[PDB]
Design an enzyme around this catalytic site. Structure first.
Site, short mmCIF file in Angstrom:
data_model
loop_
_atom_site.label_atom_id
_atom_site.label_comp_id
_atom_site.label_asym_id
_atom_site.label_seq_id
_atom_site.Cartn_x
_atom_site.Cartn_y
_atom_site.Cartn_z
N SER A 1 -3.49 7.67 -4.83
CA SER A 1 -2.20 7.10 -5.19
C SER A 1 -2.31 5.58 -5.26
CB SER A 1 -1.15 7.52 -4.14
OG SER A 1 0.09 6.86 -4.34
N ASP B 1 -2.19 28.13 -1.82
CA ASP B 1 -2.65 27.00 -1.04
C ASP B 1 -3.72 26.21 -1.78
OD1 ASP B 1 -3.39 25.25 0.93
OD2 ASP B 1 -4.37 26.74 2.21
#
Length: 330
Positions: free
Chosen positions: A199, A35
């Site tokens: 992004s 994770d």
């Protein structure tokens, strides 16, 4: 040193991925959920409340000659999906894919919430976010990666998750045969303890690319792609009959649909998520309403590039003094 381990979807939907991990001496092999959105290595154990164990493999520290109680240490964690666990702490030898760390904090669960009990395939979590998020008190502990880092050939790990197929976690090297083209690296902020990056925009299907900054986290422990409501609405508007359902808890779509791809930007580069990666199947057994793999982050408070996004790429988690993230197509 290096390590290389195969990671395997837990079910036919790629709801999560498990990777075998050797703990203790002699080795006890547990299948852990790696994770990159948390920083605790915790396991089902011989100390876990019996009624809360249902099919998981447990770590029994009394059977490990290298286990030592970390005196006075406790841990307690709550995840974004509302699940939780807590317990005490041992140090022990932990190996992943041939890479060994001695003295790793292994957090032994005394209590786990129902969602963990109900998932027989996940024996615990191995956190790979920054150690500043580790919950051990009163002495915070380091992640497996942080402990291994100085011994690694290069201070990196990579995630290569498969679509309905196994993939790979590598530590200490970049497998140049595992991706196509070049890796595009992008800046990381560690201020919130995550692999947080921005992004450069998105496209839906064959549509034009929208240049827009989307701050979010690369999180292997989250199944879906969670993005701003504007972006998500633009995606689902291209699927006939798709709608946001408050009763179901997100966007659903007719199972008869063909889903468009979704592209996200990494600098000037582009990662394309095929439409099929966005299908999470019937909302309930036999239903013709299917659950979407792109969902709104509104009210989460952060955008999450979960498995839906990451499995479309070869992803480098670069833990150099100034960390960065790299993405390649594959």
């Amino acid at each position: 040193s290096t390590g290389s381990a195969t990671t395997t979807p837990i079910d036919s939907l790629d709801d999560a991925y498990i990777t075998p991990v050797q703990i203790g001496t002699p080795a006890q092999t547990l299948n852990l959920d790696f994770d990159t959105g948390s920083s605790d290595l915790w396991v089902f154990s011989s100390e876990t409340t019996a009624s809360e164990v249902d099919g998981q493999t447990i770590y029994t520290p009394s059977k490990s000659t290298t286990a030592k109680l970390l005196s006075g240490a406790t841990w307690s964690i709550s995840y974004g999906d509302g699940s939780s666990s807590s317990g005490d702490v041992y140090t022990d030898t932990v190996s992943v894919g041939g890479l060994t760390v001695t003295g790793q904090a292994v957090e032994s669960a005394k209590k786990v919430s129902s969602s963990f009990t109900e998932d027989s395939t996940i024996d615990g979590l191995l956190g790979l976010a920054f150690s500043t998020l580790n919950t051990v008190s009163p002495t915070q502990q380091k992640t497996f990666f942080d402990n291994a880092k100085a011994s690694l050939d290069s201070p990196v790990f990579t995630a290569d998750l498969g679509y309905h197929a196994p993939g790979t976690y590598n530590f200490g090297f970049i497998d140049t045969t595992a991706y196509t083209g070049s890796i595009t690296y992008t800046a990381v902020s560690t201020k919130q303890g995550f692999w947080e990056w921005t992004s450069t925009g998105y496209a839906v299907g064959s549509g034009t690319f929208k240049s827009t900054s989307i701050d979010g986290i690369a999180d292997t422990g989250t199944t879906l792609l969670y993005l701003p409501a504007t972006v998500v609405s633009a995606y689902w508007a291209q699927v006939s009959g798709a709608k946001s359902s408050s009763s179901v808890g997100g966007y659903v779509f007719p199972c008869s649909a063909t889903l468009p791809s979704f592209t996200f930007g990494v600098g000037s580069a582009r990662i394309v998520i095929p439409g099929d990666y966005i299908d999470f199947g019937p909302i309930s057994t036999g239903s013709s309403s299917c659950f979407g793999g792109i969902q709104s982050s509104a009210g989460i408070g952060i955008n999450i590039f979960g498995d839906v996004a990451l499995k479309a790429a070869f992803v480098v988690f670069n833990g150099a003094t100034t960390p960065t993230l790299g993405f390649a197509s594959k």
